[PDB]
Write an enzyme that holds these catalytic residues in place. Sequence first.
Site, PDB file in Angstrom:
ATOM      1  N   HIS A 506       2.178   2.952  -1.604  1.00  0.00           N
ATOM      2  CA  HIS A 506       2.222   3.482  -0.845  1.00  0.00           C
ATOM      3  C   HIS A 506       2.251   5.036  -0.496  1.00  0.00           C
ATOM      4  O   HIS A 506       3.592   4.662   0.964  1.00  0.00           O
ATOM      5  CB  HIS A 506       3.341   2.165   0.107  1.00  0.00           C
ATOM      6  CG  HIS A 506       3.025   0.650  -0.294  1.00  0.00           C
ATOM      7  ND1 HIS A 506       3.890  -0.250  -0.858  1.00  0.00           N
ATOM      8  CD2 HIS A 506       1.921   0.255  -0.857  1.00  0.00           C
ATOM      9  CE1 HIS A 506       3.516  -1.588  -0.567  1.00  0.00           C
ATOM     10  NE2 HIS A 506       1.987  -1.480  -0.339  1.00  0.00           N
ATOM     11  N   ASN A 551       4.650  -3.537   3.548  1.00  0.00           N
ATOM     12  CA  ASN A 551       2.850  -2.309   2.866  1.00  0.00           C
ATOM     13  C   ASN A 551       2.305  -1.770   4.058  1.00  0.00           C
ATOM     14  O   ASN A 551       2.604  -2.645   5.922  1.00  0.00           O
ATOM     15  CB  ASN A 551       2.565  -4.171   2.240  1.00  0.00           C
ATOM     16  CG  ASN A 551       2.805  -5.097   1.978  1.00  0.00           C
ATOM     17  OD1 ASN A 551       3.724  -5.353   2.567  1.00  0.00           O
ATOM     18  ND2 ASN A 551       2.586  -5.326   0.729  1.00  0.00           N
TER      19      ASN A 551
HETATM   20  C1  LIG Z   1      -4.097  -2.994  -6.663  1.00  0.00           C
HETATM   21  C2  LIG Z   1      -3.463  -3.019  -4.991  1.00  0.00           C
HETATM   22  C3  LIG Z   1      -2.791  -3.080  -4.176  1.00  0.00           C
HETATM   23  C4  LIG Z   1      -2.576  -3.158  -2.999  1.00  0.00           C
HETATM   24  N1  LIG Z   1      -2.229  -3.587  -1.888  1.00  0.00           N
HETATM   25  C5  LIG Z   1      -1.901  -3.727  -0.654  1.00  0.00           C
HETATM   26  C6  LIG Z   1      -1.627  -4.632   0.367  1.00  0.00           C
HETATM   27  O1  LIG Z   1      -0.622  -5.987  -0.390  1.00  0.00           O
HETATM   28  N2  LIG Z   1      -1.103  -4.492   1.411  1.00  0.00           N
HETATM   29  C7  LIG Z   1      -1.250  -3.335   2.416  1.00  0.00           C
HETATM   30  O2  LIG Z   1      -1.168  -2.966   3.626  1.00  0.00           O
HETATM   31  N3  LIG Z   1      -1.621  -2.433   1.031  1.00  0.00           N
HETATM   32  C8  LIG Z   1      -1.822  -2.245  -0.384  1.00  0.00           C
HETATM   33  N4  LIG Z   1      -2.061  -1.777  -0.897  1.00  0.00           N
HETATM   34  C9  LIG Z   1      -2.799   0.176  -0.397  1.00  0.00           C
HETATM   35  C10 LIG Z   1      -3.988  -0.248   1.142  1.00  0.00           C
HETATM   36  O3  LIG Z   1      -5.065  -0.330  -0.367  1.00  0.00           O
HETATM   37  C11 LIG Z   1      -4.356   1.036   1.593  1.00  0.00           C
HETATM   38  O4  LIG Z   1      -2.854   1.717   1.706  1.00  0.00           O
HETATM   39  C12 LIG Z   1      -5.332   1.031   2.074  1.00  0.00           C
HETATM   40  O5  LIG Z   1      -6.970   0.690   1.315  1.00  0.00           O
HETATM   41  C13 LIG Z   1      -5.098   2.641   2.584  1.00  0.00           C
HETATM   42  O6  LIG Z   1      -6.895   2.570   3.523  1.00  0.00           O
HETATM   43  P1  LIG Z   1      -7.597   3.946   3.751  1.00  0.00           P
HETATM   44  O7  LIG Z   1      -9.016   4.264   4.528  1.00  0.00           O
HETATM   45  O8  LIG Z   1      -6.338   5.011   4.419  1.00  0.00           O
HETATM   46  O9  LIG Z   1      -8.179   4.908   2.300  1.00  0.00           O
HETATM   47  P2  LIG Z   1      -8.462   4.199   0.814  1.00  0.00           P
HETATM   48  O10 LIG Z   1      -8.453   2.953   0.810  1.00  0.00           O
HETATM   49  O11 LIG Z   1      -7.874   4.585   0.285  1.00  0.00           O
HETATM   50  O12 LIG Z   1     -10.002   5.213   1.290  1.00  0.00           O
HETATM   51  C14 LIG Z   1     -10.149   6.415   1.644  1.00  0.00           C
HETATM   52  C15 LIG Z   1     -11.642   6.553   0.551  1.00  0.00           C
HETATM   53  O13 LIG Z   1     -12.066   8.185   1.041  1.00  0.00           O
HETATM   54  C16 LIG Z   1     -12.669   8.613   0.343  1.00  0.00           C
HETATM   55  N5  LIG Z   1     -12.767  10.202  -0.156  1.00  0.00           N
HETATM   56  C17 LIG Z   1     -11.395  10.603  -0.867  1.00  0.00           C
HETATM   57  N6  LIG Z   1     -11.623  11.914  -0.372  1.00  0.00           N
HETATM   58  C18 LIG Z   1     -12.461  12.029  -0.105  1.00  0.00           C
HETATM   59  C19 LIG Z   1     -13.852  13.151   0.058  1.00  0.00           C
HETATM   60  N7  LIG Z   1     -12.918  14.452  -0.179  1.00  0.00           N
HETATM   61  N8  LIG Z   1     -14.532  13.473   0.790  1.00  0.00           N
HETATM   62  C20 LIG Z   1     -15.469  12.127   1.250  1.00  0.00           C
HETATM   63  N9  LIG Z   1     -14.905  11.104   0.920  1.00  0.00           N
HETATM   64  C21 LIG Z   1     -13.194  11.194  -0.313  1.00  0.00           C
HETATM   65  C22 LIG Z   1     -12.161   7.273  -1.224  1.00  0.00           C
HETATM   66  O14 LIG Z   1     -13.179   7.587  -1.882  1.00  0.00           O
HETATM   67  C23 LIG Z   1     -11.840   6.467  -0.735  1.00  0.00           C
HETATM   68  O15 LIG Z   1     -13.193   5.473  -0.301  1.00  0.00           O
HETATM   69  C24 LIG Z   1      -2.565  -1.609  -2.363  1.00  0.00           C
HETATM   70  C25 LIG Z   1      -3.291  -0.882  -3.017  1.00  0.00           C
HETATM   71  C26 LIG Z   1      -4.051  -1.407  -4.791  1.00  0.00           C
HETATM   72  C27 LIG Z   1      -4.618  -0.264  -5.030  1.00  0.00           C
END
Ligand SMILES: Cc1cc2nc3c(=O)[nH]c(=O)nc-3n(C[C@H](O)[C@H](O)[C@H](O)COP(=O)(O)OP(=O)(O)OC[C@H]3O[C@@H](n4cnc5c(N)ncnc54)[C@H](O)[C@@H]3O)c2cc1C
Lengths: 576, 575, 52, 104
Positions: A506, A551
């Site tokens: 987080h 979260n």
């Molecule tokens: C098991 C687990 C349980 C969770 N439970 C919760 C929940 O209950 N509640 C909650 O709010 N949060 C929870 N989380 C957290 C939540 O998944 C994340 O906060 C959320 O997915 C963030 O979204 P995002 O789109 O910013 O990034 P991400 O989901 O991390 O997606 C970012 C992406 O960009 C990509 N990327 C990275 N670098 C590059 C690059 N250089 N070039 C091109 N692409 C790139 C990746 O491959 C990825 O798909 C949990 C996470 C885990 C793993």
Amino acid sequence: MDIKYDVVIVGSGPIGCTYARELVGAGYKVAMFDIGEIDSGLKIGAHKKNTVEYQKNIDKFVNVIQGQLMSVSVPVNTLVVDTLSPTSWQASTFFVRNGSNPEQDPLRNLSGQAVTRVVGGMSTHWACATPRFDREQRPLLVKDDADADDAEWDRLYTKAESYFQTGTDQFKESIRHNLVLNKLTEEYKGQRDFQQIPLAATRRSPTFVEWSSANTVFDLQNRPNTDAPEERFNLFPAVACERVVRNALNSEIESLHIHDLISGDRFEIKADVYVLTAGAVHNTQLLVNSGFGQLGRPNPANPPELLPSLGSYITEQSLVFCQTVMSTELIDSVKSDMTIRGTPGELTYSVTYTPGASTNKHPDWWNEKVKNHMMQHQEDPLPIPFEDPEPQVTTLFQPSHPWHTQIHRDAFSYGAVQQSIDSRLIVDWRFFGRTEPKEENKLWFSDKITDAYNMPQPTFDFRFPAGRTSKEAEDMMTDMCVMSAKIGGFLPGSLPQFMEPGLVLHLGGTHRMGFDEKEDNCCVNTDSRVFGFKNLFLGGCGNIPTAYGANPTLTAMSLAIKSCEYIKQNFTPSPF
Amino acid sequence: DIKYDVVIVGSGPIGCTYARELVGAGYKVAMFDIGEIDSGLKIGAHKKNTVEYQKNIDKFVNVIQGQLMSVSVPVNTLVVDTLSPTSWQASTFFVRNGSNPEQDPLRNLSGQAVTRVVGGMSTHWACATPRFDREQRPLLVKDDADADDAEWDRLYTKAESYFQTGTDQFKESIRHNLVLNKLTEEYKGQRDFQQIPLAATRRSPTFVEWSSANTVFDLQNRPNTDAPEERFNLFPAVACERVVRNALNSEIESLHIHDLISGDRFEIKADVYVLTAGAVHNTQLLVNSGFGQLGRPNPANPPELLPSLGSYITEQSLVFCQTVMSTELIDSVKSDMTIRGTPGELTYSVTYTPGASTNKHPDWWNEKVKNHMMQHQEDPLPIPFEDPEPQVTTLFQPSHPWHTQIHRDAFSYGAVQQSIDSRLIVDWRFFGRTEPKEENKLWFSDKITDAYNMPQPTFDFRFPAGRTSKEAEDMMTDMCVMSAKIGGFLPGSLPQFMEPGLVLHLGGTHRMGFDEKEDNCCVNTDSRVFGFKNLFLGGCGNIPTAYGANPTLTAMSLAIKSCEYIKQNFTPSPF
Amino acid sequence: NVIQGQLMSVSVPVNTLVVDTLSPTSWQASTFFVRNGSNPEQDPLRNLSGQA
Amino acid sequence: VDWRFFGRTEPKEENKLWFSDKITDAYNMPQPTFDFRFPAGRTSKEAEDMMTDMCVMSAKIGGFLPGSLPQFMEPGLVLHLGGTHRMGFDEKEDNCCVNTDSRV
Ligand SMILES: Cc1cc2nc3c(=O)[nH]c(=O)nc-3n(C[C@H](O)[C@H](O)[C@H](O)COP(=O)(O)OP(=O)(O)OC[C@H]3O[C@@H](n4cnc5c(N)ncnc54)[C@H](O)[C@@H]3O)c2cc1C
Ligand SMILES: Cc1cc2nc3c(=O)[nH]c(=O)nc-3n(C[C@H](O)[C@H](O)[C@H](O)COP(=O)(O)OP(=O)(O)OC[C@H]3O[C@@H](n4cnc5c(N)ncnc54)[C@H](O)[C@@H]3O)c2cc1C
């Protein structure tokens, strides 16, 4: 690949997919790139838990999570192995082995921090908890007008909830869930309020829950297509995004430098608007690889000139964890309305109740489930039905108890639930602390060491702040021990503990939001626009500048929706 | 069109062999799988073929663990006496957490598991595809060993094409060659070392496209633009439950299915019925259909149909260890170099003479070593960081009747940790052959059911006394003796027998023979169920011999022969 | 157990095991300093650690 | 049944037991410090052949007990240290501390 788009989005997680939903829907020509690959089945970016097989075997999902989380910064290993055979090659020093990071101080790390590189990001495996932040945890969007600030947040959260399909009653027929919720409610006598965890999920049957994901937010299918003939969207998986090219003026981004992992080739991509949604860690790495902040070990004799707050004030939540085994009292209480005659297994064994009786302590449907389980399974010594859904209970953050709580069962990288104690008895306790943002807590990037994608190696310099963060963390541990005792004793092997720093996943504040770059020590404004740049936007938890326990993802999505309103208002889609 | 020419149960590599053959030959094919498409846009493809997994190969172990569901778990009797006094505490070791009360914990294949996903176990296997030599090989021709050899050579050649089997994708691994060359030197001609034949195509120096069911058949619905005259439909999340026998027991009339998504049940009609659901689940499906006997075996009441089904089961003994490369072998990597001065200092240098006839190693090797040692003077090893993994075998022979793999790859057990450099580590897996014995059985409960409401599988198994046991120990000793030539054991990975069935090489559950009675078998050499005109079984369950080498190629070969029989005996419907 | 109790290690090198799940309130080291009778002169990779 | 095989180690000048001039033990005496590796060459080749002989020999009696698989024990656990004040005829020529009457 065209090479010119209206909008380019880096990352296909839920936040990137927020920008895609808003902007494709507004008629922009959109491209989205992800370093990772499509694997989740025909529903691109969907939750991997939504298979019949995982839902019949939910403990195995823990292995899926463990496989896809790649540690961010692993320090050099100093474990002594002195029982090698005399013939085996044997080290003389603890040298850099197995991808480790020599820049990393092992005692100032977030060792549990990890990322997921797949289409849909971490939303392909998350636990779907999507609570709102109250004022105390949340950054201001309107100054000097709290009512207006609350109104704007309620507007954005409402939209984010519908995007994720957040609800609070998908587990309302679970006996375990209700048993626990009702007991806690009673014990606290209104000192605290308990409710279902708000979850991004839709129930499909009594034994199947369609957990939400990035796919729920935007289906990631190329457009135009039959169902959306006037929309334009292309997803490009296995593409590492390496730099956003600044003009010399640092007033605009001029292109995006990408590396196609399958062909090996590098290309430059042009858009009117650039959106980085690569996560809290990788947004920062991209920006630093492009000349923002400073590469190399922080040096205050030498402060960066562009976005000097980038990668400082980072926050990660303290996490405590334990599991409990349900009390005898609470188990007996499940079957308190039954009349029992005889001995299980005998021909005239009888478990009965009177539907509608004023003296019953439970609703008819609960007693029907109990009676049927006890009669149909006389070999089984518990009153809880075999496929009863899991408990999903919370008491949300409050000034008097400034931590988030989850009293539930779900799959995380560390969840190992075992075999000798019946799973119907087991409840998980996860309490999440808030961390004060401090300048000295940093995420920086090596000028010498590179990661597996030849990008500068992330390095943490982090400790939980002394003062309030640390006092709260330990009071939080105490509250878990006090509260969980009302439900049952600790499960041997899952005793109360702090989890490795970052395992909670987080992380925030790595590219933080605020009104004024200097005064609020921040990187983006409340439209998530990077200060000084006309056309660069950042989404994700790295925007969040406050100390929060709940979260973060729903809150990050809500900031993204506001960012999209600025974009729609200030850039024109190209003619289609 | 719920009427088809052919229905196939299971989308693993063996079902896909039938689909490739029969779709190609103009048949209107339907395939059902109880699992779902979860591998990317390439349906049923290898989950290892992502850039992220190939840069983090040790993490794939967790993926495999996640998808293998235990077949028969006995009732747990572990004592937890440190519960709090307030917690509910059992008075007996009752049936908890899906355990199987029929299962004797001391006569189990506890490591046996299944994978329910499209592509089956081929979405995560290690792709080793050796041929069986005569001693391990089922007979296709009686009494003419030259004719038998020719039939097998043809079928295996075709199976190797289907899988894209090759034997030199690792030839430019320094570690591979280091180990191969040393072993061949040490055995002074008694044994032959070569690359493990692997179902794989290298794409770059850091990327290999591992083969899978997808490689055999792409699992795309047809007709489509690339195959406009073909007819194929794949139906995932469909539990197949029974094949309906006519009263004569001469023909299958229907396949009864349960759609897991809608919840509904249907009866599907085909001319030809192919069961390729794995060695455990083919047997389950047949028993649930009235073949063999349901319930705990009862000698005093032998089954009238297919009496040998689920008897003579075989599983291989598996011994495993890891080693840490010897100091001698590491020094020999740099044997051609002249090395002066001290690493990290101004005066340091590493040179060799290109093409010199006195060099032990070719220029490509010496260049890689020279560049690693000069560019990474902080690293104490001469092996380049991105060197590919070793992939060595000496195949089963009469004097050493076990298969060997001397290699690195991912399986459900045996993950590494971080204390010893990965480049020094080599895995040793030796696989024994098991004599088929009527008392070794897989049977199904008449009262306990599994997670899909089907009769619960239960094993009654021990490694046969005699040859099998003696060879298993001789095999362990052989691994200890051979591995010692490369380096000592890696602590935490000492030589050991793995839990029975972890190796997942189960055979003989619906075995093949010439004559049902005399060869105590369930299918003939066309893989047709005796007495049935239109029911065929594919997979390792068919193999009736004691075999050590990895079975999937041999099962695929049998499936091709089965398809030839179908093609000779049924006509595709008009398109 | 009797044998284990009476054998006192001859040379114990400085311990470098990472413990990063201490509570934020607990005193937490910044270096791997000489703790618990250990011998800073001892190279952990050139020892007889079992000697006692 | 327990199997313990014990290898012989070549005496090498570089293998040492020395004592700190700064660190003291629990009895305020100079702290023992080892500088030891098993010699390459014969000691090391024999040690590994020895491991092999244990595995070969023990197989004739039974398989390994799970949890007690073949291993090298931590160096010194065996408690058979020698040569720290070694015997010989001539102090210089035999590189030694005492004569055959054990006199220094
Ligand atoms: C098991 C687990 C349980 C969770 N439970 C919760 C929940 O209950 N509640 C909650 O709010 N949060 C929870 N989380 C957290 C939540 O998944 C994340 O906060 C959320 O997915 C963030 O979204 P995002 O789109 O910013 O990034 P991400 O989901 O991390 O997606 C970012 C992406 O960009 C990509 N990327 C990275 N670098 C590059 C690059 N250089 N070039 C091109 N692409 C790139 C990746 O491959 C990825 O798909 C949990 C996470 C885990 C793993
Ligand atoms: C990690 C590991 C590594 C291995 N390495 C190798 C290798 O190196 N070499 C080798 O030869 N083999 C090895 N194997 C084994 C190899 O994977 C199998 O022998 C091979 O996949 C068998 O193929 P199959 O098509 O008969 O069965 P499977 O691949 O098991 O496929 C059968 C399928 O039918 C399904 N199904 C089951 N029941 C039903 C039902 N009732 N209704 C509908 N569908 C059903 C399944 O979901 C599945 O997709 C390995 C296996 C594992 C997991």
